[PDB]
């Protein structure tokens, strides 16, 4: 993507898309994709509970910091980000300095499994499309450690549905495309329970993210993976969900 | 209650309530309470997935069969109910014979922990305000046993929120009132994971059930327990939730 | 209570109680209650094993320090107490200064779940009627941490008997009265096993504590809860037990 | 031993032992040993709760049926025994026919791990000095299966104390002597918790069984193993205990 | 493949391969591939222990029965096969009738997770390249059920190495190619331990199977997936192993 | 033994043993025993993976340092040893100073359960015939702690085979002889899985160690325990194995 690395949710604004014959259509599409992505990040924020200006938020696998900047403009709190990409950290910070908020928002190169945050000092943290890259038990044990008792964890992610048995080929094609390891909803809920994380909200967002991918499949920038997403989301083997949980 | 033994959800129809000075007000209130209760049972049904006419549904702790009759009029399937009360079974069946559907809907005196249903033959089952009377691990292990792989379990129940530590006095007052043992959301999610039940939807309904109890606290039939419900729901120590899960 | 916050054990000295017609009867009763309470605390001490003058003992949920002062006068060791009540800490310490033993015995405001004691430095610790206020797994994990390998843990507490299924209303009435969360004997034994605590002695003391509550139910100071205790102890749904365990 | 295969408890009757110079001393000793053994079996019975005439009791590893005959003469119930020795079964039954109670008491060759008793039909069962011959998790899972909910399990056995780390040589010498596999108190309590068996009474009987072994070490029939028992019981590495538990 | 559906092990016979210029080379290659495959199946048999003529062997995910026919010609026992493919069952049986051994060897359409074999009646069973298609805990729980105590389980399979963290893209490409779900060596060993299966032999066969795939990558029949196998086997993210275990 | 405290593997060199009539035979035997012992230690090293000069290796229960000196002469790395015997530590170090390598190899008196090594700093560690002296879960949890992610653990040890049920008398005789507590292969594999140790190689070495013990049973130095080893290794109740695992 251009800013947010995650996917979006919500009905597409076809009116603003205009004529696919215009030259500026492919541009008007990128703007739309962004709008839908911002909307889902805004939705993930709605689930962090009431974070105050004095709280410290953590974003595991923060990408370019889009979610961190949004968290700060909304809550006023301090936000620490973490990623494996140096280029991405530098980017997020550069953007913060420019916004005059690098005194609250910072990204750093660090593996989300071995973070520098002290036990029980984080008020809320999240994984926005990044838990598909790490063992679930270990990332949740880490969030649980640095999370304050009563803290809030949120994760928006794609997971294969165990209701239909083993992972469908679609899920595997996506895994191969991103060199990730998509987990099952069973594994998500299991790991959370074994790590003192208790779900407060579990919501399947597949219907809200479908328009996003259908619109994306009609572009130039298409990478060939949008087919896997659309089919798996339709036959139900793959699903987009949001899980907000309390660190009990 | 009068028919449904569970509680309701949704905004109160104050217009239909009219003048609390009318003699018929206390009557118009009972009708409203019923409407809200039917609405929540209708909501629990929305989470059973697509049950077909050939499926067999189970209601653990079925009360007077209100949820069973509703399930059948909606899906056309067979519905087996279970309770400890003989008077309640007789009632549910009597109502079925009268509706001319006792060839699909039946209630029987049987403990939900030791049911007669064969392994993997039930398509969907639920606990509507009755899981607060039994050990969670054992009732979920039982549902999991008679539930078909891919089947759907739903539970609407009051649970104390572990986010606020131990059970508040309010929760204990309710327990004493009904001689029940209200569980924690942690225990609900934990038991489900240890019994091959994977939550597909988790939604806090406390805001939707609050109007129900506030309206109830203003009646003659009041039992004195409505205070415990309203306060605990407000300070957040007690919460009303719906959990729909897949038997994986 | 007046000094010890716990309950007592042993046959009542009716001779010393004299005529319930005397004015001084209600006084002679308080003295008796105290005697029975001291006797049970003395009994809990009998289960700490051979603690030496150089050992450090811990009392989780120490109340007014009665058990701590008794532990020190008997063993000569150092005793650290912990409670949530500032007024109770101040009281215990004041009493220690007066006894000229505040150089061995001290109480402090601290939650028994997050104690300041170093790993493996405590020789023996106990919960005298206070484990009913906290999650069992967490308090036992904490005792296990600061407990020396080979150390001794003791707990005297009321627990609902799982032999009779769910908690009886009596247990719930008590919970509501003290805003506590009485656990099941199953939960006690389970938590101990998951936290390297191995029971050396398990003894039901309900028969020895019954006289205590029957005598108490005949006083002025009665709070109305003595009925719940007596009935539940009689029908067997509630039980008073002592569990001495080794930190293996 | 002569009848009971287990060990005994209680103070030795030195008066009845008389002069060790008599020829009949070695005989008077066997009679004493028996008395102490009967006394411990009587003690194990005290922990079966109130078994009625219509109950079915099970003895896993029943030896010659001494405990079964005693259970029946006391309760009037039906008692099924199980052992690997055909010669021992035949003996127990022969003794029953003679007592005119083989219509209640029966022994059979069957492994205690794979019993023929139906799920939930046994009221109480026990292992008197025989759990040291089988995996603990498997024998307790079996008792739990055929045990009625609310049933009572009792075991009197020698176990190495984990408070002193690994098994002492003494314990190993005994294991080699009987070709058994003495377990740790930790393993006993652990297995019970993982198999729905909740200890109601745990009592160290080592002091009550010591006189038994000291008297035994002074006989002709001595096998050389009494040294291992006496030393290990004294240094505390080995211990004799009774555990009565409820099948919850 | 042509007969065996699994992969092979052992040094390639380049001498028998002759000139890649011959027309008959592509034929001489298929014969070689077969030889290597037969050799690995022969190797899996070496790990079934001493199965006698009266034993019943099971092959979960049997393909065309090549391993079953080989097991019978070697041991003389009865061999039951299971697969999801009707065409494959018919094939295996047809081959048995022709060999005059269909009175010992039979294949049937049945899911390896829900088999018809009775508890404890199978002497040895195996998964030859088929465990990558099912949840590991469930297939091993099933083998454990129908496996006699002391029985032997063997599995030859490809598994991603957890020593290198998450699944490499190579593993994902293979998963997508076969629509399977390759597990981690950690998951293999974990599931076995949770299902009473104790490994007696664990051997990495990646070096012995490498020649097999290198020779295969030089053919006409190539499917494009041989690259994924060779690279992942070389960088160590994917590995071919054999695990022989006892049902304890 | 004389240097290595462990046992050996490999065919006996009868030619070098010469005439058992020579006076120097009993000497030529000790030399042979040593050769076989060095060979097995060399074999354990083959399973540490590619340890580099900058790695730190740990030997839990190091005896006289024979395995440590061998590890260093082969890899060039730093090797820390641990034992309970002061005399053994002094010996290992003395030998290191003499070899001019005490700047890489060191032994110290420390219990392998509570080591001073920092979390994740050790590249590979092992237990050569010493895990039979400690609880398995605790020693493996310790290795896992100080072991780097991706590190390698190896253990060569005698374990009773669970395939034959409970420990045979032979195993018990050995336990009594060394005052150790021989574990079951089940316990070895179980503990490893619960402590993030995943077996890469599991190999029964009983056939390779048998010649070692048969040759030993024909000497003067015989202690009487060689009978237990030979018989148990033959009837299969006891077994010598090597387990190499990765810290995942
Ligand atoms: C890729 S999805 C968005 C982000 O996840 C991050 N990510 C993936 N695995 C990570 C890990 N193990 N630790 C920290 N960040 C990770 C990437 O660096 C990227 O910024
Ligand atoms: C009470 S809430 C509604 C229902 O739960 C039922 N119930 C409570 N515990 C039960 C149990 N253990 N088995 C079956 N029904 C139960 C009551 O009979 C009643 O019909
Ligand atoms: C109440 S019973 C006796 C004591 O338990 C203490 N208590 C209850 N919960 C506690 C906790 N979580 N931490 C420390 N003390 C506690 C009270 O302060 C009181 O002194
Ligand atoms: C020996 S102690 C007393 C008894 O335990 C029995 N015993 C030992 N192991 C047994 C098993 N696995 N199943 C049934 N009885 C057993 C012996 O047969 C003997 O009667
Ligand atoms: C494919 S690998 C070889 C075999 O595995 C079988 N297989 C895959 N999944 C199976 C399952 N769940 N139950 C039985 N056979 C299965 C296929 O039918 C095929 O014969
Ligand atoms: C005995 S086998 C070889 C070694 O194991 C050591 N050993 C046994 N138990 C130990 C423990 N708990 N901690 C450290 N070394 C131990 C002995 O000191 C000896 O050097």
CA distances to A57, C217, C224 from C211, rounded to whole Å, are 56, 10, 17
Contact F202 E202 (CB under 8 A): yes
Count CB-CB contacts under 10 A for residue F214: 14
Q: Among residues D40, F27, B204, which one has the least CA distance to residue A245?
A: B204
Question: What values do phi and psi take at C57, rounded to 5?
Answer: -105, 150
Residue C242 per-residue DSSP state: E
Q: Which listed ligand is nearest to A88 at the C-alpha?
A: 1
Structure token pair of residue D225: 């193993």
Q: Among residues B181, B168, B131, which one has the least CA distance to residue B153?
A: B131
Angle at B213 between CA B167 and CA B5, to 5 degrees: 85
Regarding the beta carbon of C129 and ligand 3, being less than 6 Å apart is answered: yes
Mutation for testing the D interface, residue in C150, C164, C189 having most D CBs under 10 Å: C189
The answer to whether residues E216 and E226 touch, using CB atoms and an 8 Å cutoff, is yes
Question: What values do phi and psi take at E141, rounded to 5?
Answer: -70, -35
A167 Cα distance to chain centroid: 21
In angstroms, the separation between the Cα of residue D161 and the nearest Cα of chain C is 9
The answer to whether residues A42 and A128 touch, using CB atoms and an 8 Å cutoff, is no
The answer to whether residues C7 and C40 touch, using CB atoms and an 8 Å cutoff, is yes
CA–CA separation, D49 vs B42, rounded Å?
Answer: 49
Paired residues of A89 in beta bridges = none
D134 vs F166, F172, F181: nearest CB: F166
At C35 the three-state DSSP class reads helix
- Work out which ligand 4 atom sits closest to the CA atom of D111: 13
Question: What values do phi and psi take at A2, rounded to 5?
Answer: -90, -40
| Helix D86-99 and helix D66-75, axial crossing angle in degrees, nearest 10 | 30
Paired residues of D122 in beta bridges = D147
Count CB-CB contacts under 10 A for residue A50: 9
C169 vs B133, B167, B179: nearest CB: B179
At D84 the three-state DSSP class reads coil
Residue C119 C-alpha to ligand 6 middle, in angstroms? 24
Q: Among residues E130, E153, E196, E201, which one has the least CA distance to residue F200?
A: E201
Resolution of the PDB structure in angstroms: 2.2
Q: Among residues C65, C73, C125, C117, which one has the least CA distance to residue C90?
A: C65
Between chain E and chain C, are at least 3 CB pairs below 8 A?
A: no
Domain A1-248, CATH: 3.40.50.150
Sequence-distant (6+) residues with CB within 8 A of A38 are: A4, A8, A66, A70
* b/e B5-15 (16+ beta carbons within 10 angstroms → b): bbbbbbebeee
E21 Cα distance to chain centroid: 33
Chain D residues lying within 8 Å of C200, measured CB to CB: 163, 185, 202, 204
- Based on the number of CB atoms within 10 Å of its own CB, is E67 exposed (0-12), middle (13-18) or buried (19 or more)? buried
User: What single string gives the DSSP state of each residue in chain B?
Assistant: --S--S---S---HHHH--TTSTTHHHHHHHHHHHHHHHHHHHHHTTS----TT-EEEEES-TTSHHHHHHHHHH--EEEEEES-HHHHHHHHHHHHHHT-TTTEEEEE--TTS--PPTT-EEEEEEES-GGGS-HHHHHHHHHHHEEEEEEEEEEEEEE-GGG-S--HHHHHHHHHHT----BHHHHHHHHHHTTEEEEEEEE-HHHHHHHHHHHTTSSS--S-HHHHHHHHHHTSEEEEEEEEEE-
Contact A162 B204 (CB under 8 A): no
Count CB-CB contacts under 10 A for residue A108: 15
Sequence-distant (6+) residues with CB within 8 A of B78 are: B55, B56, B57, B72, B104, B105
CA–CA separation, E86 vs D35, rounded Å?
Answer: 71
Contact E133 A166 (CB under 8 A): yes
- The residue with tokens 């030889």 is E35
User: Residue A92: enclosing H or E segment and its boundaries?
Assistant: helix A86-99
The protein residue with its alpha carbon nearest to ligand 4, atom 4, reads D61
Which residue among A61, A111, A127, A139 is best mutated to probe the pocket of ligand 1, counting the most ligand atoms within 8 A of its Cβ?
Answer: A61
- The residue with tokens 């980017």 is A91
The answer to whether residues D124 and D45 touch, using CB atoms and an 8 Å cutoff, is no
Question: What values do phi and psi take at A155, rounded to 5?
Answer: -140, 130
CA–CA separation, B213 vs B238, rounded Å?
Answer: 13
Q: Which pairs count as long-range contacts for B116-122, CB under 8 Å and 24+ apart, including other chains?
A: B117/B56, B117/B58, B117/B80, B117/B146, B118/B146, B119/B145, B119/B146, B120/B145, B120/B146, B120/B147, B120/B148, B120/B149, B120/B151, B121/B56, B121/B146, B121/B148, B122/B56, B122/B57, B122/B58, B122/B146, B122/B147, B122/B148, B122/B151
Residue F184 C-alpha to ligand 4 middle, in angstroms? 21
Angle at C175 between CA C171 and CA C179, to 5 degrees: 175
- Work out which ligand 5 atom sits closest to the CA atom of E83: 15
CA–CA separation, A26 vs A29, rounded Å?
Answer: 5
């Amino acid at each position: 993507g251009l800013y947010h690395h995650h996917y979006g949710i919500g009905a597409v604004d076809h009116a603003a898309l205009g004529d696919p014959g215009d030259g500026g259509y492919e541009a008007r599409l990128i703007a739309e994709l962004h709008r839908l992505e911002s909307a889902q990040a805004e939705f993930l924020l709605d689930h962090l509970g009431p974070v105050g200006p004095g709280d410290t938020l953590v974003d595991a696998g923060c990408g370019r910091g889009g979610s961190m900047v949004m968290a700060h403009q909304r809550f006023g709190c301090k936000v620490e980000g973490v990623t494996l990409s140096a280029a991405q950290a530098e980017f997020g910070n550069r953007r913060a300095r420019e916004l005059g908020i690098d005194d609250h928002v910072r990204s750093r190169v660090c593996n989300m499994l071995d973070t520098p945050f002290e036990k029980g000092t984080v008020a809320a943290s999240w994984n926005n499309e990044s838990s598909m890259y790490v063992d679930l038990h270990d990332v949740f044990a880490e969030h649980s450690r640095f999370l304050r008792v009563g803290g809030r964890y949120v994760t928006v992610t794609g997971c294969w549905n165990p209701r239909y048995g083993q992972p469908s080929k679609w899920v595997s094609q996506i895994n191969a495309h991103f060199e990730c390891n998509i987990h099952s909803r069973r594994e998500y809920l299991r790991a959370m329970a074994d790590n003192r994380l208790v779900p407060q909200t579990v919501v399947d967002l597949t219907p809200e993210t479908l328009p996003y991918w259908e619109l994306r499949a009609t572009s130039s920038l298409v990478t060939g993976i949008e087919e896997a997403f659309i089919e798996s989301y339709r036959d139900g083997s793959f699903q987009y969900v949001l899980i907000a949980a309390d660190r009990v």
